[PDB]
């Protein structure tokens, strides 16, 4: 199916002393493959998946130089934005950046994106055409004008439509054994007597990859929303994800309810119904 490569960058100013804390992560789909942290000892881009360890020392030299260039740009931006917004030098502020590309089934370019935030709010973002910018306020409007005069969109576009896709494909091929395997959710249902007259049924989806999934309850074949709870999708810690959904039901009416599970790794959605 579809794939993406995305990088995430966070910088947090430390007004009391020293430089900003900077953390960068890269992902292919829902798999983290690299990191950098300004507070770690290596001061290098580090692997976080086995299939990237393949890459030779020029890869790692290169990525390390680039990521440090990103941390310095953020450090300058933290000073510039504090002045554009007239804030004191006493407080800690945050800049966040995310960019990447998607490809379709065919592994051809589908879309690219590059977005930037200040203190948790949209600041500036590249538009879907990759030729122009969306600024959220008048400070970001100043940044937009600077980036337009400097032709930033052209060079991003060259990377989003070219380089990014080319490397995504190479990683998909090198990490084939995991990156192109989907892991269907392992499902089961639990039953909890809330009281003598009601019960809770909980539908579990475990150990699945990728993270995108839908769990929906039905009563006599129709969707039910009342009296349900759905937790956010959560990482298991071994690279797969977990989710569950629950519904409260009158005790003795369990057979009427069914949990439906949709996931890329499942040709047909699964249906679960209580009576093991």
């Amino acid at each position: 199916g579809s794939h993406s490569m995305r990088y995430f960058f966070t910088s947090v100013s430390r007004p009391g002393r020293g430089e900003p804390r900077f953390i960068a992560v890269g992902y292919v789909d829902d798999t983290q493959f690299v990191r950098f942290d300004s507070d770690a000892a290596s001061q290098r881009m580090e692997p976080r998946a086995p299939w990237i360890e393949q890459e030779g020392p020029e890869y790692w030299d290169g990525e390390t130089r680039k990521v440090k260039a990103h941390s310095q740009t953020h450090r300058v931006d933290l000073g510039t934005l504090r002045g554009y917004y007239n804030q004191s030098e006493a407080g800690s502020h945050t800049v966040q950046r995310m960019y990447g590309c998607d490809v379709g089934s065919d592994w051809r370019f589908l879309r690219g994106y590059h977005q930037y935030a200040y203190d948790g709010k949209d600041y500036i973002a590249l538009k879907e055409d990759l030729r122009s910018w969306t600024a959220a306020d008048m400070a970001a409007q100043t940044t937009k004008h600077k980036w337009e005069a400097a032709h930033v969109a052209e060079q991003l576009r060259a990377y989003l439509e070219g380089t990014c896709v080319e490397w995504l494909r190479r990683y998909l091929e090198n990490g084939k054994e995991t990156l192109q395997r989907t892991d269907a959710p392992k499902t089961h249902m639990t039953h909890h007597a809330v009281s003598d007259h009601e019960a809770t049924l909980r539908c579990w989806a475990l150990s699945f990859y990728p993270a995108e999934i839908t769990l929906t309850w039905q009563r006599d074949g129709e969707d039910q929303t009342q009296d349900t709870e759905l937790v956010e999708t959560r990482p298991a810690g071994d690279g797969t994800f977990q989710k569950w959904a629950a519904v409260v039901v009158p005790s003795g009416q369990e057979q009427r309810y069914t949990c439906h599970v949709q996931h890329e790794g499942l040709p047909k959605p699964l249906t679960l119904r209580w009576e093991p």
Partner: peptide, 9 residues
């Protein structure tokens, strides 16, 4: 594979 070092705001 990271983009080249970005341009400052």
């Amino acid at each position: 594979y990271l983009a080249p070092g970005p341009v400052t705001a």
